[PDB]
Amino acid sequence: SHMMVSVIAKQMTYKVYMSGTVNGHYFEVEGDGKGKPYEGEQTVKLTVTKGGPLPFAWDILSPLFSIPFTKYPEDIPDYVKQSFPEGYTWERTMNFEDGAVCTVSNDSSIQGNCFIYNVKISGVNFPPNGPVMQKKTQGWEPSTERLFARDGMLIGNDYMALKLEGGGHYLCEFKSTYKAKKPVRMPGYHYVDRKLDVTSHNRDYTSVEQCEIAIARHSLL
Amino acid sequence: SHMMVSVIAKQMTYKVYMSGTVNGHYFEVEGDGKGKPYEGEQTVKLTVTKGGPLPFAWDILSPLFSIPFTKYPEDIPDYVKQSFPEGYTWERTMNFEDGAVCTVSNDSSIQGNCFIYNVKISGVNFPPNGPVMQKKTQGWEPSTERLFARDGMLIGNDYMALKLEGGGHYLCEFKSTYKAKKPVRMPGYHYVDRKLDVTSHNRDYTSVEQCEIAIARHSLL
Amino acid sequence: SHMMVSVIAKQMTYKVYMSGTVNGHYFEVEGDGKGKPYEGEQTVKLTVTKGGPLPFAWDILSPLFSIPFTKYPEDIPDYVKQSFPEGYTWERTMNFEDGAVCTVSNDSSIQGNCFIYNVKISGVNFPPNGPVMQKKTQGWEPSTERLFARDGMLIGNDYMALKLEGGGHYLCEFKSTYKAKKPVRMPGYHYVDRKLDVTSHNRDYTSVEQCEIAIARHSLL
Amino acid sequence: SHMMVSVIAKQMTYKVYMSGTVNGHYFEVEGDGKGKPYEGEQTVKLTVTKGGPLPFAWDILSPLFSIPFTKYPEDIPDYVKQSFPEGYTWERTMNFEDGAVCTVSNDSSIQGNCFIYNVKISGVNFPPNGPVMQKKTQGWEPSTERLFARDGMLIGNDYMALKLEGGGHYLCEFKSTYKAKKPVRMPGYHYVDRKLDVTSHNRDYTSVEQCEIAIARHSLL
């Protein structure tokens, strides 16, 4: 079994606060979630508190609403979990195959049994007739992030794909940079498999429930 | 002489309001500017009003503070000036050669003799020992933007370069998408030459003055 | 068990013919290999026949010397194996994180018990003091290609990483496009895990022996 | 007037030898050219000699057929002309907006009154229904290359655009790296304007004539 850290219970909740701008439209979202950090399981309920209903696909926000909830096997150092109680920050670029770009920054803290995430997203050049502004997406495929240490930062790359109405895929590249706020034991080259689903939502996606499973590992061969 | 639009005087002022995050650091800036829109000359005084003094090179913000102040020869339609009084928006990506990326959005309107600009920037993945975080930049080379029409929008690209303390250059690619808030007459493929200098600043760059000359043209050949 | 095709025996050999140019240096390589296509196992012995010894790292050529040797599970259509006897072509871009770029094209045929591969590589902008021209690489990490169907072509993306002398990683992005020469049954979204090793070589890598294991699969979750 | 190097006459000829592969199709081309190097004027007659008639737009080859024929004002050092008699090499990437990519390498020498060019191109991932494979291009816009010195090499970038049958543009980014075969005096940051036209061709573009004007300069402001 993997070393559990005492500041992170086997059952934890969290609060997430998002603000951002996508194609010039400002908006804010708040969520409360919960899960089992050492099993890699979590769920979150989101509420659009400003700028709703959103004129773009909800799916582009889904993977922005909790990386402490990743199951790590015994021999792989868990970068993110070691960073607590002080916490971590990360920065992410999303490059969509039709030219749209998002930049994302996150600050993560802990208060007792509850993680606190603050996240900002900026999105530009989503084509007006594209699957995002026309809400043609049907959730992400499961995906695998490739992670490795560099300058005491963790670096993640992920080939993502939104499912399209009536077959087809809309590609997105994730590049992520994770920075603990204190020095920790770096892991080596490894992967995290993820599966993310919207399990329920209202008509204009102003209330949304998501859930995720994330499990780290070495190569299979 | 180029046609002059009655809603834009030969001398104008403007106010610019900017908020943003760069490597996770929030900041706000306000500016007051003036110039001669049909001669392509302007100056602006900027004040950091939140999150100052900034921990990053001022030069990455410089080109975000007024495209109505571009001189257009008579035979080239002026996309930006035609958009008034309704105004315009634009979005910009900034891709630096060490992998930092900025997304920018802008909304621009007019009140009498005064343009009003609202601009938001999100910049991520500046290397902590690179010339931006170590404030080693020494202003921008004069540059040229290539512009053409597509789908009712004016598309621009610019290979920019920052000057480096100790000679040499730090490269940045600009991609811009300008969208008038009403249909306007579309120009053909053309160029805009620009020179942009910081003419004065205090020690921690919390007060900065910039001067810019911008002139559109056809190919020189 | 997966459907085996009659034109592809459980034990097969192959011949591979490479010519190319890397940083302006022309060279040619020939290899003979063998393996078990339905088990995903193969080995190949390469000989540099022109332009040797090569002034660059052998590792940049390794993943160019046999995709019929991929183990597919029963329920996933095997695009490449269906394309025979007529065969297939593919095109690949390799984008290295220090700016170097390779383009690759391949034509694959079959004669009896022996596949025949013709491959061309063009490589440019490898920095003269980089790990490639200074031969600092220490083989690839195992990796996973993400594959999906589009316009009856198969499309693969792979986040690759060369191991560096004294710790460290040198990243490379693979984008591949595979085209059967006759229509076949397209698969859905899936992955291929690969592990590629140089098992033996002489002093200046003019004779090189490699081996590979490649196994397709769905997501693990 | 700019200094004139004694090894380069006011009128010169040149031979150009080209081989390459585009979407897997091999071809060779030979050309004979002439012009006035210090005035920046040249013409060239090309003959497809293998793999003709070409199944792809001739325009993607056009800018690969002689940079000594660039007029340099007196105060800007001429990197290419100083390199002689030894000569130079260069490498170029061509990135089209629908994801096609070309890598190019060149070697250039001199025999008396005649430059000799050897050039290789590899182009991949042209979409089969795009304007290159469907021969819908109508020549290149006049363009400007940005040039600066780094590590003894002259680096160039150019936002190019092909004209499209039916108005509109198909964008391509040029990155070029020019390397003299001996140390030379390095120019500062500057530009080269170019116009390149096909002046005549037969029906299947197996004989083509091109004309190019190239003039270096500082920023216009």
Numbering used by the authors:
A (entry chain A), B (entry chain B), C (entry chain A), D (entry chain B): -2 to 62, 66 to 221
Provide the publication's sentences verbatim.
Fluorescent proteins (FPs) are widely used as optical probes in molecular and cell biology. tKeima is a tetrameric, large Stokes shift red fluorescent protein and the ancestral protein of mt-Keima, which is widely applied as a pH-sensitive fluorescent probe. Accordingly, LSS FPs are useful in multicolor imaging experiments, such as those using two-photon laser scanning microscopy, dual-color fluorescence cross-correlation spectroscopy, and FRET. tKeima is one such LSS FP, with maximum excitation and emission wavelengths of 440 and 616 nm, respectively. tKeima is the ancestor of mitochondria-targeted Keima (mt-Keima), mKeima, and dKeima. While the pH sensitivity of mt-Keima is well characterized, the pH-dependent properties of the ancestral tKeima have not been comprehensively elucidated.
To obtain a better understanding of the effect of pH on fluorescence emission, the crystal structure of tKeima at pH 4.0 was determined at a resolution of 2.2 Å. The crystal of tKeimapH4.0 belongs to the P21212 space group, with two molecules in the asymmetric unit. These two tKeimapH4.0 molecules form a tetrameric structure with neighboring symmetry mates in the crystal packing. Analysis of the electron density map revealed that the chromophore of tKeimapH4.0 adopts both cis and trans conformations. Occupancy refinement showed that the occupancies of the cis and trans conformations of the chromophore in tKeima molecule A were 0.52 and 0.48, respectively, with B-factors of 32.17 and 31.47 Å2. Meanwhile, for tKeima molecule B, the corresponding occupancies were 0.58 and 0.42, respectively, with B-factors of 30.15 and 30.06 Å2. In the cis conformation of both molecule A and molecule B of tKeimapH4.0, the hydroxyl group of the tyrosine ring of the chromophore is stabilized by hydrogen bonding with the OG atom of Ser143 and a water molecule, at distances of 3.10/2.27 Å (molecule A/B) and 1.83/2.12 Å, respectively. In the trans conformation of both molecule A and molecule B of the tKeima chromophore, the hydroxyl group of the tyrosine ring of the chromophore is stabilized by hydrogen bonds with the OE2 atom of Glu145, the OD2 atom of Asp158, and water molecules, at distances of 3.06/3.15 (molecules A/B), 2.99/3.38, and 2.64/2.37 Å, respectively. In the previously determined tKeimapH8.0, a partial Fo-Fc electron density map in the trans conformation region was observed, but it was unsuitable for model building due to insufficient Fo-Fc electron density. This suggested the almost exclusive existence of the cis conformation of the tKeimapH8.0 chromophore, whereas tKeimapH4.0 showed both cis and trans conformations. Based on the spectroscopic and structural analyses, the cis and trans conformations of tKeima represent the fluorescent and nonfluorescent forms of the tKeima chromophore, respectively.
